[PDB]
Amino acid sequence: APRGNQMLGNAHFRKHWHKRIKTWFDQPARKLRRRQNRQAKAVEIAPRPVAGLLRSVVRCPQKRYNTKTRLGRGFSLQELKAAGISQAQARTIGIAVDVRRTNKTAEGLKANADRLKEYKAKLILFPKKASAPKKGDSSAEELKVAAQLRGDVLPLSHTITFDEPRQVTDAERKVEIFRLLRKERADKKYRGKREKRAREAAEE
Template sequence: MHCFRTSFFLSAIFRPRREVGNHGTQPKWHAFEPPLPQRLADEGAHLVQPACKEDSQAKGPYHTKVRAGRGFTLEELKAAGIHKKTARTIGISVDSRRRNRSSESLQANVQRLKEYRSKLILFPRKASAPKKGDSTEEELKMATQLSGAVMPIKNVHKKEKARVISEDEKNFKAFASLRMARANARLFGIRAKRAKEAEAESIDKKK
């Protein structure tokens, strides 16, 4: 016969959980946290952030929605001609962990960085000794303080107009095209090897 015994070694750690269960109220330190996209937007409201799409596995219309990301990638900064250490000093958020998975998002964020850099007016630390990259005196006179989010991201929904389906679209077989593309990608190496061997054999026969 076995004896089952329950031990409570972490009694102090689970005290907040017991308070929730016993009194039906949450402890004082437990506060409501908004979802991640909203937190990122609130934290980086004073910084320029990249445009990122929602998770591709999201259901409904959410996978096409564009939101503010945590920071620009090092590849995007390099393409825009901005050093990663300089970016943090001029109001650009940087995320060294994020990776670019498509050339479209890379080009869009690079263009976003270039637009921000063209609108940015950089004051010199010493007015008597301006450095390379600082704004000129004429640009400093035109400077105005920005209030609110920096270059906010707006989702614009474009409706496509109804049109007549063409004959090419009617005859197009999507499933067969996808299978053919997968087969070509899978057999690319084998076909290249066979073509190389056949070329070598033809050269040997000529000799």
């Protein structure tokens, strides 16, 4: 029997919730377990990076996020072709391939092409058989510097830059920004009705 000014109750506890209870007392244990797994993987696959395959640069889908970038599943076939890497070579060299992703814009393609080029520049390739090096294979004093990389490979930078101060131009000042926005909205809203009127006029 609620009394006085209250916020109406909303608790979802009318089910036999005591049968389905999950506690987090093992959070530090899980943290330690994952650290140990990472260490074991690093030992297993040394000197290769612990993170694993190299991932691509992506733009977040929706307009709420499209001003940001993040890591992707892999590199598109167009991107690999532009960077001059075969899909098989990427697979054996440790580059993620996104067989589903396709490029529709030169800027997006070029960003990942540059990422691939930089990774190839930073790559160190050990001889297949230590005794006999081959072509494309890294040099001995380069191999002496090889060390395991921890964290993301070629991590992205999320720093925000401020545009340089400039001068306000009269062409800029003369524009009617609000009227322009309202005009665009009106044009989009009334496109179809205008087409119908034009068709009716043509028939007449």
